[model samples]
Target chain A: VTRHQVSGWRFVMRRIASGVALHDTRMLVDPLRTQSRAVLTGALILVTGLVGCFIFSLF
Target chain B: VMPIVRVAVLAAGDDGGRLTEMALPSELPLREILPAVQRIVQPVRLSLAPIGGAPFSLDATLDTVGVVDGDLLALQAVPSGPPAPRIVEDIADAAVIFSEARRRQWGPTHIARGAALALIGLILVGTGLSVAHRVITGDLLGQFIVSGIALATVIAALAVRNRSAVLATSLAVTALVPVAAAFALGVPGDFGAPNVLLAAAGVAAWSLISMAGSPDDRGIAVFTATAVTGVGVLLVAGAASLWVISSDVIGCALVLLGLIVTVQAAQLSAMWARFPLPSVLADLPRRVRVSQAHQTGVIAAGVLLGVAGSVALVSSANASPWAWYIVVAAAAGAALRARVWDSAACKAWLLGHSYLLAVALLVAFVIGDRYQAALWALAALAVLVLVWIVAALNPKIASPDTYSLPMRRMVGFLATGLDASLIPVMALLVGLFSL
Candidate 1:
């Protein structure tokens, strides 16, 4: 079912609870396959660096 | 042809209450006919009333109001109300009040999101300041800690970029990460490993931010890429200056990079010249146009970066004189290409490249000894005069249509020659040639 096909009460509840519109969630999830792998890899590298820094701080 | 209505105009206070006969086009509205009547009667505020009927509205036509041939119209002065304000002023005041009311009427979600964005901005600024402080004080560990925190913030931003409310804020923070890193790491007096690291980090950040953002979010992507690329170019220039004393290696590398970038920029500009790009953005056609504009803007930034690099190369002392000549020619060629396109982005590119060309020539003149410098300047002036004469002789050569197939082929040949000459020119400058 399409996002707009959701029950009106459920859509309102979701919007109020998350403070994010249905369209936004759709934009995030719908184009996952088309998103650039290079950008994802860079994000991964940045996350790794952040983790490394945390580990260094622990030591 | 419109039928004519003959009307008799009678002024309220005339010498003898004379009736003037006038013919007005029946199809035209009273508003269009008012000015001519006003000029004849010369009343400050003129109003027309039928002898025993209601006054005519500005929108009513002569035929609509049933004014036939020789109908007497009484002209009365409409006492001006306290000098009416300009429509623009009224609109401005109304807009301000309306915006204020709209702000008050916003839902909780909007206000909350706005506050969250503000808080995020404040925290990022505080972190940037702390990082700058660490760099200034030479506290390596402190620098690392604050820098890491900044990176963590970027990670958070990236995670939430899909949310419409905070999408722009997130993209902004993500894009600025490289600039902050460059600033923090580039405080040292000499070029070293950190600058190289900064460059690599900048590249990665730009790639990530640009790629992660959806096509619809290309405005932020273009802005981010341009800002990061500009900072990277400046960093490269500063680093090259430090390496000048050791060897000409960095200079050679910069020239090679600059040439390649300039050629790429030319290609991008050509692409942009052929394509051009809005809405509340719901309409697919408008969305596509906006996307095209963003793409053009990004390509324009690439052109700017390429020209800036060439300018940086020419200002350096390490590059060969022949290298300087090649860069000048490339910059001039780019400016000429921009001129031929006659587009907004092309015009901006032309202005920027022209300024850089001036700087490059000035630097080249000052690079040699006193006598040689004067000779170089004189020769440059002669070349400028010759170019002016050529342009004046056949203005069509400089027109937008001059970028035709034949001219484009000629430019391609010249670019190939310039590209092919780099190796031998470098060899000769570096004393590898025996002549």
Candidate 2:
């Protein structure tokens, strides 16, 4: 399985064990990673825009 | 602490042997109890295997053999025949199993990244189909959309402290500009070869500046070279399809440009070594966290570009065999340099480039004007022989243990070469079928 699945399991176990066991990463593992991933994805889109603009300017 | 067991020990010669309540660990091998059995009976030359026509072999644990408290274990004299060679699941067996698990730890992250990149590339290509319509209809502010997206990414990456993001930003800049240039060329009577070359120079600047903070500056250089080579290949493909220039001119451009990239790779490496980055540059390589599999993908990208680009050089430029000679020479030189430096990364560069060139040449044999399957086969054989030679000779200084650096590099070379050869091998098969 993928690492995300493994990470999901960790959060799942925490959710099930909720109030009984205290966890630092109670619900924020995947969300945190998503934030970082989105950043790169955004940059990609931006670069795509920049390329479009750069080419149009030459014309 | 497991339950101790008392086994009945009987001497071979004695009829009424003293039954000792022998204390034994449950986890201990069955043979461990033999010495205790010997102590109690004190036989002159006691040989122990399993005497009872009942349970386990000599190597099995007492627990596995079903030995329990008050169980009878009779000892016997040495057998008259030659000793039977027995196989046991020992420490070595456990070690082998663990090693297999270790090798498989490299995961599927690379595949996911490649898919993501491909999706983006497709979007660019799809837009190219309607370039004229977009150019006429699109506003200047529309271009700012990508820039805004990049800004958002920059903000998020800053929050997460993603250093690889810096390198990615530079890469995106280089890639996006050429794409923009394509749209400009779409408007008719616009595209110039010299301007494309100028943009290529711009890509290098962005790559160098991006390296300032990256943890793996060397990796970025290689990665950027790969990226540029990809763009270079695309440009050549465009030249061929658009008939922007004659085949000879296209051929000359590809060969000359490839040679430039090859030289730049060396110069960049040497420059980085001679003048290290300032203290301000962050160790971004750690942030990027390119796992082993990810690096493999990166190397594979370079290999793909080299193969495709070199083929174009031969097919379009009508380059001489001397061009192929130059490729071989550069590949061999890089590998040898890496060997002398005793650097794993350097060795990897050699493996990557050599494998690419060798595969490219074989591909040319397949894709070129001739349908000579025999020549392709010979070319493939030559590549394998060359790879085997590199593997044998370029190993790191021999270590006493199995974890020899040279040996590892050599194995990597063999594996990478074989993997890189797969595409050309397929091409060869396809060509034969077509014939």
Candidate 3:
């Protein structure tokens, strides 16, 4: 049924259930399924650059 | 006229002699009409069963439930089931679900309680500050006592369980204690104590503001107001510190810190815009909108701090003519970032960066002429503006990604080179390195 057809309580319940389910799926499955190695590498590089900048400024 | 169905409701275990007559709308759902019946019958748990038929679902209307006028309905007690598992995991899950439901139904009492606790925290912190100021000296023992008090406040703030106004207030007070003590104790140091304390407070306040994720609007507002006040105090104290400290190193460091803060603020704004909360959450839309406002406020505060720091750098006694040029370059970079990104988040901060650029220009115009540097700065600015205008007038060049691969690589290389060069250049201007 469309959202407007549902009662307010049912709508709220559906939202909470769906949010929990999606959050669980992401936590449990996304790490294995998604290609996030590049993202992690990029973040690591950025952090290293920041540290280098701080060290350089000290001199 | 709407038809009204009058039904007699008899409580379970009670004889038919004490039936309560409730007039309910025929077309309305039982869920909507049950409350009036509930108010009259005062049942702990209620379910409607026809006199000779099965229980009717609450979602059914009177007509759908086949309830005609003067029909007798029995209000049966909802069946109780065996208790759920008492295992830790199951209990925790149930507790979390219950808390989530309760949190969704926050009312005036919750707000009032939060405000009351916050007021008590404010009083406690105020009293602590006054005691620390009056009782503690600048001696070793006094410093130890002050440190203990600061540590105690931090512990107390962290111990607060409710993420509400009280927690925000306590956290703000926790941040303020050490800074306030440092200011009062007058610890001997080459560093400007007031300036450092003020900057620390500003940083602490901004950090607290950025950590805001509460669904409670009023509670967040209290925290934001407290932090904004800290930012204002920083601005005033920064000006005084700049006047007192003539060290080129300190001034340059403050400017660099401001640049970092401004960049982080912009990045935060971009992140919020680009990746909002997941759509499944019921409050996603409102939460994302409020977060955008929070980021905008952060950007504004960051710009103010950055401008103050830049002014401090340029006005230092040992400041070089290159100082003004450096400020101009930073401003140019800000503009370039905003224009090249061309995203809504970047556009949100464009006005603040533009203001920063304008301030840098004015400062350069006023100060750069002492060493015959104003003309050079102005010439550079004019060229930068001309390039920007040309790019803006032509759509092909305006978008950074539309360029050929080699051109894009060259632009990236040059940008990275410039970014790397700024650190040494700033160090040289600040007298951190000699020729």
Cα lDDT tens digits for candidate 1, B107-197: 8878877876775676567666766676567666655665666566566556665665246455454445534564446656554545654
How does model 3 score on DockQ? Answer: 0.02
Report the candidate with higher TM-score, 2 versus 3.
Answer: 3
| Stretch of 10 with least lDDT, candidate 3 chain A | A24-33
DockQ of 1: 0.01
Off by over 4 Å in 2: A1-59, B1-192, B213-219, B223-270, B273-313, B316-338, B361-370, B373-378, B381-435
**Full ranking by TM-score:** 1, 3, 2
Where model 3 places Cα greater than 4 Å from the true spot, the runs are: A1-59, B1-246, B262-280, B291-305, B316-318, B339-342, B348-355, B360-397, B433-435
Model 3 docking category:
incorrect
B1-435, model 3: which lDDT tens digit per residue?
Answer: 889988899774645445788787898877676777867876355677887767777677889777779999987655455878444333324444544533555688788767757755764565465545545443456546555655565555555525554564446444454545544445445435474555457445543633453324333423443454355445545655666644555545555655555556646554544433224688776665556555545545545554555666665345577776666565545544454444474454543565555546557557654435455546655765776688679876666567788987776666556533556778777654775
lDDT for B414 (candidate 1): 76
Instruction: Summarize candidate 2's per-residue lDDT along B279-337 as a digit string, tens digits.
Output: 45474553333332223323344344444444554452344654444344334443443
Superposed on all Cα atoms, the candidates' RMSDs to the truth, in angstroms, are: 21.9, 21.7, 29.1
Worst 10 residues of 3 chain B by lDDT: B213-222
Candidate 3 lDDT, tens digit per residue, A1-59? 76676775554454444445332312333342234556788899999999999999999
